[PDB]
């Protein structure tokens, strides 16, 4: 995706401060809590009845590091998100059957987490840059749905 040099550096700079493990589990957990219907893909994770139960669930945390880790390696290839996520896109469609709308919801929750985590450092321009990124990633992941 095409990002200005300014947006490029802004995203890269903030991400160097991110604890991938923690943020990944935090974002996935808030997804399951704020949009309960997304729990349909995680019946095998166990107890997800309460926020506390969701945030303290070991499977949620493990998966947290997993998806965000892939997301992270994606930031190293902003010039070709489609190509970078082609295989994962095929996987979420043909085998996991995940409605692409979910990628967008997770993208927005991720933004909320970053703002909560960084406070005033997550300025409006920084947010705008990240909104472009998450939208780009969501589209790259939905690209091979058929």
């Amino acid at each position: 995706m095409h990002l200005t040099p300014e947006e490029k550096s802004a995203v890269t700079a903030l991400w160097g401060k991110v604890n991938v493990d923690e943020v990944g589990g935090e974002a996935l957990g808030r997804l399951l809590v704020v949009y309960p219907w997304t729990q349909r893909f995680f019946e095998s994770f166990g107890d997800l009845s309460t926020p506390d139960a969701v945030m303290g669930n070991p499977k949620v945390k493990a998966h947290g590091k997993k998806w965000l880790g892939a997301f992270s390696d994606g930031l190293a290839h902003l010039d070709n998100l489609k190509g970078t996520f082609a295989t994962l896109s095929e996987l979420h469609c043909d085998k996991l059957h995940v409605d692409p709308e979910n990628f967008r919801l997770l993208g927005n929750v991720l933004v909320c987490v970053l703002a909560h985590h960084f406070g005033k450092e997550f300025t409006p321009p920084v947010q705008a840059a990240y909104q472009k990124v998450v939208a780009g990633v969501a589209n790259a992941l939905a690209h091979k749905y058929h």
Partner: protein, 140 residues
């Protein structure tokens, strides 16, 4: 829904008559082809044209709508059971209800040349939006 909307809906749905189930299957087919992402919710179905599973599901959908029309002045209670079902088990993302509503309008338009006037078109869109709102009211 204004009283006029209620009149247009009943008139249009009456014309549908016994074709309801058949129109419900067509709308589903139209949805699966036009909006492929909606297929993620039916990985267990044979989604080929003329599939028995699609026709059968089409009639259930159609029957529910018919129930909604007959109880338009009290839909939340009339669809209470379906609301619980989509909210707690099926868990279909809300965005998808607008896609099916659109395909249902396309289906009605293609079969009701004389009844699908601009006014009726407007009332049916509001009606399906109200139905969709009821079906997702218990999600959170």
């Amino acid at each position: 829904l204004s009283p006029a909307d209620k009149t247009n809906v009943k008139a249009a749905w009456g014309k549908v008559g016994a074709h309801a189930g058949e129109y419900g299957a067509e709308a589903l087919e139209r949805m699966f082809l036009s909006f492929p992402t909606t297929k993620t919710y039916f990985p267990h179905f044979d989604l080929s044209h003329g599939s028995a599973q699609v026709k059968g599901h089409g009639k259930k959908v159609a029957d529910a709508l018919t129930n909604a029309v007959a109880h338009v002045d009290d839909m939340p209670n009339a669809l209470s059971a379906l609301s619980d079902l989509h909210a707690h088990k099926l868990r279909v993302d809300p965005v998808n209800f607008k896609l099916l509503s659109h395909c249902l309008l396309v289906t009605l338009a293609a079969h009701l040349p004389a009844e699908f006037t601009p006014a009726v078109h407007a009332s049916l869109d509001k009606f399906l939006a109200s139905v969709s709102t009821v079906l997702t009211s218990k999600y959170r």
